[PDB]
């Protein structure tokens, strides 16, 4: 229980390793993304470069990099008073996991 | 003699000596308080944490400061 | 893994530049395998205000660690 979870990753066995990965994906912080993929509800991902994407997850991974479709990139570029709202639609998209900040699940 | 930084943080924890933690720049804040516990990765929990910009900041309570931002821990 | 070769800088005054702007001078006391360093009697060189009796520096933000002594 507590010992295996706190146990350093270089001494557990192979079977307990993928069991730990499955447990992390089922009961954990990524359970949110797993549920969002399973019931097919859109997610609003806020990237590091001030880009918000609205999409439906089709596969995620440990590093939180996901494949998305029906992506709709929304971002604003500004300087001083002037602001312009630009949007872009992408059919199928791969997304690296080092950029994401907060992943919001649609209510 | 040689004292490792882990032992130094342990001494801070044991003697409850107040520390002023320098979060690195482009954040522009400092944390002052007492260390209650530390981790492997320089993660520290702080009691009576005081927020100070770079002195009119607001107390935060008990916080867990992630170690990827800490730069100095001075008393 | 491999401890950095700082066994000759022990108890000798060194000046190391924190991040890209700050520069801190003190007496080295110990080090770790991450190049964390604990240095006593620090002084933030800029007038220059002392830091404290015992400070630790995370080895991520150290760039250079030149020594101001005989070595």
């Amino acid at each position: 229980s507590s010992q295996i979870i706190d146990r350093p990753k270089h001494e557990l066995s192979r079977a307990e390793l993928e069991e730990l990965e499955e447990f992390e994906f089922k009961h954990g912080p990524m359970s949110l993304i797993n549920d969002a993929m399973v019931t097919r509800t859109p997610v609003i991902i806020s990237l590091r470069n001030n880009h918000k994407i609205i999409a439906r997850v089709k596969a995620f991974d440990r590093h939180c990099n996901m494949v998305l479709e029906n992506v709709k990139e929304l971002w604003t570029e500004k300087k001083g008073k002037n602001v312009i709202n630009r949007e872009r639609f992408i059919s199928k998209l791969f997304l690296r996991g080092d950029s994401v900040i907060v992943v919001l699940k649609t209510p | 003699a040689m004292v490792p930084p882990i032992n130094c943080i342990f001494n801070f924890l044991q003697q409850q000596t107040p520390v002023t933690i320098w979060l690195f720049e482009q954040i522009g804040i400092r944390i002052k308080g007492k260390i209650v516990g530390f981790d492997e990765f320089m993660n520290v929990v702080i009691d009576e944490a005081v927020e100070i910009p770079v002195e009119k900041g607001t107390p935060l309570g008990k916080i867990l400061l992630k170690g990827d931002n800490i730069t100095l821990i001075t008393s | 893994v491999s401890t950095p070769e700082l066994k000759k800088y022990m108890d000798k005054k060194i000046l190391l530049n924190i991040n890209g702007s700050r520069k801190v001078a003190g007496i080295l006391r110990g080090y770790d395998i991450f190049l964390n360093v604990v240095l006593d009697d620090a002084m933030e060189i800029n007038n220059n205000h002392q830091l404290g009796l015992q400070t630790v520096i995370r080895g991520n933000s150290i760039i250079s660690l030149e020594a101001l002594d005989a070595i």
Partner: peptide, 16 residues
């Protein structure tokens, strides 16, 4: 023994 984190564990755990 992998990344220095394991070695630091085998120091901090004894320290506590």
């Amino acid at each position: 023994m992998s990344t220095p984190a394991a070695e630091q564990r085998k120091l901090v755990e004894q320290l506590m």
